[PDB]
Ligand binder design. Sequence first.
Ligand SMILES: *[C@@H]1O[C@H](CO)[C@@H](O)[C@H](O)[C@H]1NC(C)=O
Lengths: 49, 49
Amino acid sequence: KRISNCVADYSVLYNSASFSTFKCYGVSPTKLNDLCFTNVYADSFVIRG
Amino acid sequence: VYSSANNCTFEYVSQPFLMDLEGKQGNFKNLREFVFKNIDGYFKIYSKH
Ligand SMILES: *[C@@H]1O[C@H](CO)[C@@H](O)[C@H](O)[C@H]1NC(C)=O
């Protein structure tokens, strides 16, 4: 999935309170929305526990 | 309009716009002008009925 010409908020992606795990390296998780990037690449697949 | 497609990212819909699908042989009653530009890859639309 490629996200282009869009504006989005990551606050609603965090207050779900349903994710069993969350790791996010390369940037502090509290200060990523204000930082601006060019493109966002998302991949979806299943995996075991 | 084409045979098939493989992959792309952008897709835009905007508001619905209605036409008349009946064709006649009478005189014209409207004039439409369009301008298409591309500066640094940015696509431009200019029109006025
Ligand atoms: C679409 O697929 C082609 C392979 O034919 C590839 O070269 C191209 O980079 C792909 N486009 C995107 C946006 O990934």
